[PDB]
Write a protein that holds these residues in place. Sequence first.
Motif, mmCIF file in Angstrom:
data_model
loop_
_atom_site.group_PDB
_atom_site.id
_atom_site.type_symbol
_atom_site.label_atom_id
_atom_site.label_comp_id
_atom_site.label_asym_id
_atom_site.label_seq_id
_atom_site.Cartn_x
_atom_site.Cartn_y
_atom_site.Cartn_z
ATOM 1 N N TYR A 192 9.822 -9.126 43.164
ATOM 2 C CA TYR A 192 9.667 -10.441 43.795
ATOM 3 C C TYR A 192 9.803 -11.544 42.755
ATOM 4 O O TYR A 192 10.502 -12.539 42.975
ATOM 5 N N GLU A 193 9.144 -11.360 41.615
ATOM 6 C CA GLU A 193 9.195 -12.348 40.543
ATOM 7 C C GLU A 193 10.558 -12.501 39.900
ATOM 8 O O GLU A 193 10.956 -13.610 39.537
ATOM 9 N N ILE A 233 6.832 -3.725 43.097
ATOM 10 C CA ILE A 233 7.119 -4.688 44.159
ATOM 11 C C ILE A 233 6.956 -6.127 43.675
ATOM 12 O O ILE A 233 7.763 -6.998 44.016
ATOM 13 N N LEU A 234 5.928 -6.381 42.868
ATOM 14 C CA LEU A 234 5.707 -7.720 42.340
ATOM 15 C C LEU A 234 6.776 -8.090 41.328
ATOM 16 O O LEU A 234 7.295 -9.210 41.342
ATOM 17 N N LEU A 276 -1.053 3.486 43.628
ATOM 18 C CA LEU A 276 -0.988 2.198 44.302
ATOM 19 C C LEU A 276 -0.654 1.055 43.349
ATOM 20 O O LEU A 276 0.194 0.219 43.660
ATOM 21 N N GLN A 277 -1.325 0.997 42.199
ATOM 22 C CA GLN A 277 -1.064 -0.087 41.252
ATOM 23 C C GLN A 277 0.373 -0.048 40.743
ATOM 24 O O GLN A 277 1.013 -1.091 40.607
ATOM 25 N N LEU A 323 16.156 -17.665 41.780
ATOM 26 C CA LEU A 323 16.202 -18.863 42.614
ATOM 27 C C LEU A 323 15.917 -20.113 41.787
ATOM 28 O O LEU A 323 16.591 -21.117 41.947
ATOM 29 N N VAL A 332 -5.383 5.470 43.389
ATOM 30 C CA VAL A 332 -5.418 4.050 43.085
ATOM 31 C C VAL A 332 -4.444 3.696 41.965
ATOM 32 O O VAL A 332 -3.862 2.616 41.973
ATOM 33 N N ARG A 392 3.020 1.157 42.359
ATOM 34 C CA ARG A 392 3.842 0.626 43.446
ATOM 35 C C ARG A 392 3.765 -0.882 43.461
ATOM 36 O O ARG A 392 4.792 -1.554 43.504
ATOM 37 N N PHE A 393 2.542 -1.406 43.442
ATOM 38 C CA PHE A 393 2.332 -2.843 43.507
ATOM 39 C C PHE A 393 3.053 -3.535 42.369
ATOM 40 O O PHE A 393 3.713 -4.558 42.571
ATOM 41 N N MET A 399 13.383 -12.078 41.431
ATOM 42 C CA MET A 399 14.155 -12.874 42.389
ATOM 43 C C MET A 399 13.720 -14.345 42.400
ATOM 44 O O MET A 399 14.555 -15.245 42.449
ATOM 45 N N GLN A 400 12.411 -14.585 42.349
ATOM 46 C CA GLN A 400 11.885 -15.937 42.235
ATOM 47 C C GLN A 400 12.499 -16.641 41.032
ATOM 48 O O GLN A 400 12.890 -17.816 41.110
#
Lengths: 56, 51, 58
Positions: free
Chosen positions: A27-28, A23-24, A16-17, A34, A13, A19-20, A30-31
Amino acid sequence: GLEEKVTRMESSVDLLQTRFARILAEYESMQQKLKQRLTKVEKFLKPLIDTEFSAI
Amino acid sequence: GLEEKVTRMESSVDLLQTRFARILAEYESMQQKLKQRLTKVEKFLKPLIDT
Amino acid sequence: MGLEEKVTRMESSVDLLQTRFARILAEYESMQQKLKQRLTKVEKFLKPLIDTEFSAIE
Ligand SMILES: [Zn+2]
Ligand SMILES: [Zn+2]
């Protein structure tokens, strides 16, 4: 065997965190780019926008 | 008792990971479309906007 | 003692994970809708303006 399984699951677990989180973060980031780009476009166009709608 | 509880936690993580993968995929796909749309718009305003 | 303690801690970690992410998901949907609206206003303003005043830009 159960305590062994749960001990391992903890590290799983955690993996997993991590990795998460990445990935987040990507994403942020790049957000964020933009929004910056979008904001520059809005600032550039502000005088044209105002020419169309706002007197004086 | 505890076996069923641990099984249930494995399934929760499984479901959560699956929700994450699919939902983040849908957000990334939409983000790409926004990038593409923004790139068109910027192409109209170059080289003025960069300057 | 060890087993039960791990199960208890794990329950809590998994709950936290699920809550944290329901919260992140809500912030994304919100920021993405706002970005879309902003982009849409720009696009809807720019197309007819190009067409009528700055036509060769296309
Ligand atoms: Zn005009
Ligand atoms: Zn709980």
